[PDB]
């Protein structure tokens, strides 16, 4: 049956024990009162969730307390009035029942957009992985720190699809899939930064570039997500467990996850600036077209497009920010794989050498 009916009717016993006997209306719950007096009762936030804490609502009640204690939204406590006649409750005539307290199409469109983006990226990435794995000769530190990134993208896309299905099409499985989704997203965001760090170390540390650095790289790429998502889940468990934790609720709780995702991208931007200044010198020693191409190749590998919105608050520009950051960003997997695995690298040359031999 309808769970909302039970949720609103939970007050039935609460007023029956108190018992112009109290009557449960579909909109609000009414306490008992005398005959021939005017009664004021508060209205709940569940119907005012459309504007939760954005707008305030007056509560003119003379006195109401019942272990009210904590309230998620102090402002959204409206007051509704109803008169008690000798026959009981009258209709709330003076419109006070209402006095207290395209987007869907856009969300569906962006859903479809990033779904197709993730699907095509997954297909291209699996083709790239298959064509890259077969040649043992090509494998090297680079190809590895590339396979790891591709696997991270695999995990991201797969987890996004599983979340979408299992959720939209208070069970524990939703909690687990949420945690896994956060884990994979954080893993991808860190792996981008690790790729940039590796390139910066390579160019700067010309001599003795690799000293077990790649082993250290895997730990930071996969380990930091694990710890951060586990501590996020733990703290969330201590705090409110409502729904499936989809809502960000308190900004403090969402800071633990959000902080790494802005730190990694900012450090990646700084490293990209360093790379650009370093390449400029090599280009100058006796160029605009060359510089343009190199910068264009770097942005998909370094996920720099996130910078243009990483600084702004999430609430503002929810229409132009999200579309660019997600629908088009879903093609990042497709673009990087085409730009490096097929267009560049010695993968194309080895394939041509093998085809003629076959």
């Amino acid at each position: 049956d309808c769970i909302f009916k039970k949720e609103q009717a939970m007050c039935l016993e609460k007023i029956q024990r108190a018992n112009c006997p109290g009557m449960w209306d579909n909109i609000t719950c009414w306490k008992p009162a005398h005959v021939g007096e005017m009664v004021l009762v508060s209205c709940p936030e569940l119907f005012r969730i459309f504007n939760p804490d954005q707008v305030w609502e007056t509560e003119t009640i003379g006195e109401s307390d019942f272990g009210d204690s904590n309230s998620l939204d102090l402002s959204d406590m409206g007051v509704v009035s109803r008169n008690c006649t000798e026959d009981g409750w009258s209709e709330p005539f003076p419109h006070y029942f209402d006095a207290c307290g395209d987007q869907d199409y856009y969300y569906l469109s962006v859903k479809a957009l990033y779904t197709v983006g993730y699907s095509t990226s997954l297909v291209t990435l699996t083709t790239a992985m298959v064509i890259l794995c077969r040649f043992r000769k090509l494998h090297c530190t680079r190809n590895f720190i590339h396979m790891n990134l591709f696997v991270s993208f695999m995990l991201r896309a797969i987890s996004v699809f599983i979340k979408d299905w299992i959720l939209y099409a208070s069970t524990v499985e939703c909690k687990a899939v949420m945690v896994f989704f956060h884990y994979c997203v954080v893993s991808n965001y860190f792996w981008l930064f690790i790729e940039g760090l590796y390139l910066f170390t390579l160019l700067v540390e010309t001599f003795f570039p690799e000293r077990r650095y790649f082993y250290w790289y895997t730990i930071i790429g996969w380990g930091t997500p694990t710890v951060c998502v586990t501590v996020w889940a733990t703290l969330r468990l201590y705090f409110d467990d409502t729904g499936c934790w989809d809502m960000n609720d308190s900004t403090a709780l969402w800071w633990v996850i959000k902080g790494p995702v802005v730190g990694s991208i900012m450090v990646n931007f700084v490293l990209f600036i360093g790379i650009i200044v370093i390449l400029v010198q090599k280009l100058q020693s006796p160029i605009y077209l060359r510089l343009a191409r190199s910068t264009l190749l770097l942005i998909p590998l370094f996920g720099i497009h996130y910078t243009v919105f990483a600084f702004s608050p999430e609430n503002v520009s929810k229409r132009e920010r999200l579309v660019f950051e997600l629908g088009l960003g879903s093609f990042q997997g497709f673009v990087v794989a085409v730009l490096y695995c097929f267009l560049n690298g010695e993968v194309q040359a080895e394939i041509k050498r093998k085809w003629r031999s076959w």
């Binding site: 969730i49 990033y114 809502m247 969402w254 996130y306 999200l322």
Partner: peptide, 28 residues
């Protein structure tokens, strides 16, 4: 990240519409 922003906004919209539909159907 962007994905969280989507899931959150979409779930908030879904709940808002569920409760609004319930209220409109039952009140009127």
């Amino acid at each position: 990240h962007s994905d969280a922003v989507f899931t959150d906004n979409y779930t908030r919209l879904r709940k808002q519409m569920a409760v609004k539909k319930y209220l409109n159907s039952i009140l009127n």
